[PDB]
Amino acid sequence: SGPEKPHLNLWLEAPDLLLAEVDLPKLDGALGLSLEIGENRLVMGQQLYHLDAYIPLQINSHESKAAFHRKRKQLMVAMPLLPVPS
């Protein structure tokens, strides 16, 4: 047995806005859930679920936000993108 890898949704809502949707049905409540975002990485960590993903985009970690939707059992992440090289 062990923690399961959830289902992840990624898309570009805008050229500089990346949105995520993690499905956590067995989970309820944002307490006991940690989220870590790097420049090209997404870490979601109680040990019921765990998700270590690599994103092929430059993420603004400081201005990123997240929220756990209780009705739909989903973790929603909002990752603004860093300015691209000229």
Binding site: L10, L17, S34, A67, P80
Partner: protein, 149 residues
């Protein structure tokens, strides 16, 4: 001699309140033309009359349901009035009538970010159209997880 052309003259000269008079006279003499209310809404914006500009834009949209520039002016007006979700729906309409409109793409990012900052997650995530722009998957940063719904 056109009352709209005369109003545009005052507008280039920055005389916004005098262009509104011409635009009003042109509206009262031709209620079917959608250029006049959109032009007067644009002059209203120049003098921070955002409430009055929204009505002049809706009037133009009722007349011409495809007037892209009318949605654009109502979009900025609705932002200053705080109606962010309604502003988002206007600029996304522009993006359908004028795919690639740069004012629309810019203001949509600025609006969808402020909507998430204020907590209206569903207004962005549920009403989203760009769900097909899929993205297939060094110190870390701890991001706190608020709640919603």
């Amino acid at each position: 001699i056109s009352e709209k052309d005369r109003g545009n003259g005052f507008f280039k000269e920055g005389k916004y309140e005098r262009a509104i008079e011409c635009y009003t006279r042109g509206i009262a003499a031709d209620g079917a033309n959608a250029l006049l209310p959109a032009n007067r809404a644009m002059a209203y914006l120049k003098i921070q009359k955002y409430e009055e500009a929204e009505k002049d834009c809706t009037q133009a949209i009722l007349l011409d349901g495809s007037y892209s520039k009318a949605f654009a002016r109502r979009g900025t007006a609705r932002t200053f009035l705080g109606k962010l979700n309604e502003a988002k729906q206007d600029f996304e309409t522009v993006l359908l009538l004028e795919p690639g409109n740069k004012q629309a793409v810019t203001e949509l990012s600025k609006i969808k970010k402020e909507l998430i900052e204020k907590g209206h997650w569903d207004d962005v995530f549920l009403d989203s159209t760009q769900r097909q722009n899929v993205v297939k998957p060094k110190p870390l940063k701890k991001v706190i997880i608020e709640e919603t719904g």
